[PDB]
Design an enzyme around this catalytic site. Structure first.
Site, PDB file in Angstrom:
ATOM      1  NE  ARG A   1      -4.457  -1.298   1.786  1.00  0.00           N
ATOM      2  CZ  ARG A   1      -4.691  -2.601   1.908  1.00  0.00           C
ATOM      3  NH1 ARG A   1      -3.743  -3.414   2.357  1.00  0.00           N
ATOM      4  NH2 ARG A   1      -5.879  -3.095   1.585  1.00  0.00           N
ATOM      5  CB  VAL A   2       4.270   2.136   1.081  1.00  0.00           C
ATOM      6  CG1 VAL A   2       5.315   3.195   0.759  1.00  0.00           C
ATOM      7  CG2 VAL A   2       3.885   2.188   2.552  1.00  0.00           C
TER       8      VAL A   2
END
Lengths: 143, 183, 281, 65, 40, 272, 140
Positions: free
Chosen positions: C142-143
């Site tokens: 998700r980064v």
């Protein structure tokens, strides 16, 4: 359409021509070579071997050579409305002359003569003679 | 149960797995406590391949290139890759058939089947089930035979020459016998 | 920090919090730490074993209701502090065993809900030679590219699309003999990249070497090769560059960018290597 | 030569096209002998009760047998 | 579907490789006479 | 249960995937087969149209020979079904009048279809033919086998390839030497035969036989591939439906397992 | 798990072959049932498996002695049921039983006592089966 010769030269693996308009087409009939043009009568003929030579209407002087092993030719009269006369050259193996070789030809001739030296069967003798015929034709036709 | 600087205990524990479910809490917890693992299957025993060891569920902390050399490590990993490749064609074979498979895939399937039949061997205590005598296959012999089979120097041999043998000599002997009995 | 099976359930339950306490010193003091919780499921297990013996009320799979709260308290300490606190950080790499691959269970769903990503390892790929057996289809982050240098972005943005196309045309590998071009090139590039990402145990590489190798891979210098030789290819290339063009690696490590001049130097080195060496296909 | 030798024109034409293909140049000869391999499996019957089954991969043995 | 496909696969493979093993048993002793016990 | 539904879902998903792959493969093969047709039909049409000028009556009495063309792989829709249906119709129609029927075939499917019902009429069967492209297994061989087994009247059943989603089953009443000798061939007097008619007819008729089989089998192959694509489509659709149903059942069984285990735990916690 | 240790030698001799044949039949029949065309070595497997499967059927409350089981499975294993029709076996059994209970009690007594099949009993049983097939006629 036009008063040309609609040639279709076809083998099973490839159709070289479908409705090609030409002027004259030479073919090696079983009796002897002959040239079909527009107006020629309806006829059927068996071919033996040699170099078909096609001559388009646009070409006139330029030609196209194709070696044929065996097959048939069918010349069919022109329909009243089409105005054009059709011809079908069917060949079991139709190569150009550019793709032929005289060395593998002579090698196959030698191997055929070797196999046929033991002349016992009629089919073996006939095949030896016909191979001699066709391979001599290939040698004489190749460049 | 562990080795120390005074002695050593080599332990071998048989773990019942109810309903062939490896997700049960007891074996799930027991898996973490073991150095070497050997999982037996019914789908393999149905083929008469005894011992019915699944080589795609069996593992070991020892199978590393520094402990066992690369001749062993690469051989084992190649065997596992071959068997997984064979497993990844089962549906294609069941739906379409062997006609669709290329000759590479047919070679793969043949070698994988040969390995499957070759890993089988008869034990001395199973005489009262099979009647056949028992075998003791050393490890260099096993590695030689596996390397040979994977390299392709036994594709000329049949497949039924493997399901009771303990080496390549016995495989060639069984194939010889089957060829003589064929005529 | 070792909380083994002989050690009691409270110690197995407390060891992760002790590790987080040991890492908070590095976090608060402007340093960086990475903590690795091995078998968090044995933590949750221990908590269950302590709740069913303290006669606490259970839930589903007999786990109490304070499990999400437990893992949350544990994992929410992993952070990146601002420049007024010191600039420290505390990364986390919790590990979880799935008993059948089902990540819909209670503890997996709680942890994927708590975490900032996922690295999904599979068993079908561990035996196909794909080691690490990372399934990049289910693995996400998700980064994302914000945690990447540009030298890695420039190749990863391409390789992700290429591998997605391979994943779209994977089943055709057993029929590629019958297909046409524009679909065998995808299979070839995907196979080459999959054989490139393979790696050896206890043999990690640096980011510069990674960038160089992935440039060699994505730029088509491995399509015409036999895949089995790529493991050689990579190795030789690595030795070559570490022997010859340490300047390229130092520049990539210092500037954190792959400029056109360094890219030309890289293509030059690759061409020299291919000329010096001979491969199967 | 063929109605006398007990041979069909199709057999003659095929067995001569084989030689003509043997007299080809290698790049086109590869595709020619490619496209003209043989694989057949004849199965003879007589009110059921199969008399024989035989495979064929050559033109000459296919026409002979 | 499961036992169906499994048994179909097993039967097809059995037939195919039975044929292949028959052919190999036919053509073994010629290409490998050092193993033929008929000549030993 | 759960294991059953999960295994079924896995199998059906694999089936759907392989089905789509085989669909694309069959599309490619249909492209190449259409190419072979467009190149190889002109080789066959002229001599067939020539010899068809001699009209053949299908009511003639005599030893009939029925050549049924079919495939060797399955999942071809129902083209071989329609072929065997037409063959059964023809056999049952011609065996009433008393014509002794013989059966030649191409492919294992026609054999499996007609073994039990007309296996006492087989004469010669060929198979393993279209492993390669078609004219690998040259039609000249089968034509020679027919002439060596010269019947009094010959019929050929095959599937015409109209378009990529449409075929058509046909029966060709084929001329034979008995039927040529029984006609003076006055219809060909408009044609000049370079060798005499009596000397060239025997060599022309073998070519006619070969060309007939060639085009018929090409059309049958194209129809087979079209039906294969259609069957793969239908199979993928049915697999998707089954996957939906099994997903519903799987979720139901999951909820049931959860509720049962939880009620067990609660009753064991409250039974103290 | 006990297996052959709880089994007579005369029954071992037949049951081993029977188990092998039934294993092969169970393996092959699922693929065979799709209408494919198989060789004769596989058609024989299918025929023998169908014969044995039709042999192992029994009526309720109709048990049989061990010697009679041995004789029937001998008839089934040595190939005296392959050409015969499956549906006929259900009487081929019964008639054969009556025959060997009528005229060949000595074979049954010998098998019951010695608990094995010597070559003499082998030949006598083969002769009895041949006489029975001669005296009787079935659909194949």
């Amino acid at each position: 359409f036009k008063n040309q010769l609609l040639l279709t030269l076809s083998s099973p693996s490839e159709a070289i021509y479908v409705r090609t308009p030409v002027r004259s087409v030479t073919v090696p009939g079983s009796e002897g070579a002959m040239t079909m043009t527009n107006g020629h009568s309806q006829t059927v003929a068996r071919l033996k071997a040699g170099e078909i030579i096609v001559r388009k209407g646009e070409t006139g002087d330029e030609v196209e050579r194709f070696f044929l092993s065996d097959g048939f030719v069918l010349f069919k009269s022109p329909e009243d409305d089409s105005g054009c006369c059709t011809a079908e050259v069917l060949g079991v193996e139709v190569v150009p002359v550019s793709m032929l070789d005289k060395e593998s030809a002579a090698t196959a001739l030698q191997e055929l003569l070797q196999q046929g030296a033991g002349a016992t069967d009629e089919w073996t003798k006939a095949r030896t003679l016909l191979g001699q015929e066709l391979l001599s034709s290939v040698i004489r036709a190749a460049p | 149960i562990t080795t120390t600087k005074k002695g050593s205990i080599t332990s071998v524990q048989a773990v019942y797995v109810p309903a062939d479910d490896l997700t049960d809490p007891a074996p799930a917890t027991t898996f973490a406590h073991l150095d070497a693992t050997t999982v037996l299957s019914r789908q393999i025993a149905e083929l008469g391949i005894y011992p019915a060891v699944d080589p795609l569920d069996s593992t070991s902390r020892m199978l590393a290139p520094e402990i066992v050399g690369q001749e062993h490590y690469d051989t084992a990993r190649a065997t596992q890759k071959l068997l997984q490749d064979y497993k990844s064609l089962q549906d294609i074979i069941a739906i379409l058939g062997m006609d669709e498979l290329s000759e590479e895939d047919k070679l793969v399937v043949s070698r994988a089947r040969k390995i499957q039949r070759f890993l089988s061997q008869p034990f001395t205590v199973a005489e009262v089930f099979t009647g056949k005598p028992g075998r003791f296959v050393e490890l260099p012999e096993t590695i030689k035979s596996a390397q040979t089979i994977l390299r392709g120097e036994c594709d000329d041999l049949p497949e039924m020459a493997f399901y009771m043998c303990g080496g390549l000599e016995e495989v060639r002997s069984k194939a010889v016998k089957m060829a003589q009995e064929a005529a | 920090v070792a909380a083994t099976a002989s050690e009691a359930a409270p110690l197995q339950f407390l060891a992760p919090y002790s590790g987080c306490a040991m890492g908070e010193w590095f976090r608060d003091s402007g340093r960086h730490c990475v903590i690795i919780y091995d078998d968090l499921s044995k933590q949750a297990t221990a908590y269950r074993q302590m709740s069913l013996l303290l006669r606490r009320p259970p839930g589903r799979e007999a786990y109490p209701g304070d499990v999400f709260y437990l893992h949350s308290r544990l994992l929410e300490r992993a952070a990146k502090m601002g420049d007024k606190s010191g600039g420290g950080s505390l990364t986390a790499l919790p590990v979880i065993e799935t008993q059948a691959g089902d990540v819909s269970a209670y503890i997996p769903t709680n942890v994927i809900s708590i975490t900032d990503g996922q690295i999904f390892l599979e068993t079908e790929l561990f035996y196909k030679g794909i080691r690490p057996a990372i399934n990049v289809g289910l693995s996400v982050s998700r980064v994302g590219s914000a945690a990447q240098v540009k030298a890695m972005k420039q190749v990863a943005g391409t390789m992700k699309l290429e591998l997605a196309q391979y994943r779209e045309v994977a089943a055709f590998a057993q029929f590629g003999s019958d297909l046409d071009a524009s679909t065998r090139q995808l299979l070839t590039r995907g196979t080459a990249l999959t054989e490139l990402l393979k790696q050896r145990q206890y043999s990690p590489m640096k980011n510069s070497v990674q960038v160089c190798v992935l440039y060699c891979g994505v730029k088509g210098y491995l399509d015409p090769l036999d895949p089995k030789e790529i493991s050689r290819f990579e190795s030789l290339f690595i030795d070559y560059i570490n022997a010859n063009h340490q300047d390229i690696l130092k520049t990539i490590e210092t500037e954190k960018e792959l400029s056109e001049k360094t890219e030309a130097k890289l293509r030059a080195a690759v061409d020299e290597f291919v000329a010096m060496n001979e491969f199967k296909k | 030569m063929w109605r006398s030798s007990g041979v069909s024109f199709t057999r003659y034409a095929s067995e001569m096209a084989a030689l003509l293909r043997q007299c080809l140049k290698e790049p086109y000869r590869t595709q020619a002998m490619q496209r003209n391999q043989i694989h057949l499996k004849e199965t003879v019957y007589q009110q059921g009760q199969v008399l024989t089954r035989e495979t064929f991969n050559d033109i000459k043995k296919a026409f002979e047998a | 579907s499961v036992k169906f496909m499994d048994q179909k696969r097993s039967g097809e493979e059995t037939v195919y490789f039975k044929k292949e093993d028959e052919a190999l048993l036919r053509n073994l002793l010629a290409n490998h006479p050092e193993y033929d016990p008929k000549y030993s | 249960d759960l294991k059953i539904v999960a295994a079924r879902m896995k199998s059906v998903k694999s089936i759907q995937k392989i089905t789509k792959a085989m669909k694309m493969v069959a599309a490619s093969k249909l492209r190449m087969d259409q190419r072979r047709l467009e190149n190889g039909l002109p080789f066959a049409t002229p001599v067939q149209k020539l010899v068809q000028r001699i009209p053949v009556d299908p009511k003639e009495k005599g030893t009939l020979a029925v050549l049924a063309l079919s495939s060797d792989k399955g999942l071809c829709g129902g083209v071989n079904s329609f072929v065997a249906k037409q063959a059964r119709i023809v056999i049952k129609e011609n065996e009433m009048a008393g014509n002794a029927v013989q059966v030649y075939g191409v492919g294992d499917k026609i054999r499996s279809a007609l073994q039990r019902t007309f296996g006492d009429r087989f004469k010669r069967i060929m198979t393993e033919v279209t492993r390669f492209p078609w004219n690998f297994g040259q039609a000249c061989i089968i034509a020679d086998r027919l002439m060596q087994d010269n019947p009094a009247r010959l019929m050929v059943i095959y599937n015409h390839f109209k378009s990529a989603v449409a075929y058509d089953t046909l029966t060709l009443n084929v001329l034979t030497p008995t039927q040529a000798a029984q006609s003076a061939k006055e219809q060909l007097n408009t044609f000049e035969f370079e060798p005499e008619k009596t000397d060239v007819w025997k060599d022309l008729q073998d070519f006619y036989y070969a060309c007939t089989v060639f085009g018929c089998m090409l059309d049958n192959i194209a129809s087979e591939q079209s039906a294969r694509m259609s069957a793969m489509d239908n199979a993928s659709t049915n697999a998707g439906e089954m996957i939906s149903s099994l997903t519903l059942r799987y979720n139901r069984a999951r909820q049931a397992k959860i509720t049962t285990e939880l009620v067990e735990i609660i009753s064991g916690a409250n039974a103290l």
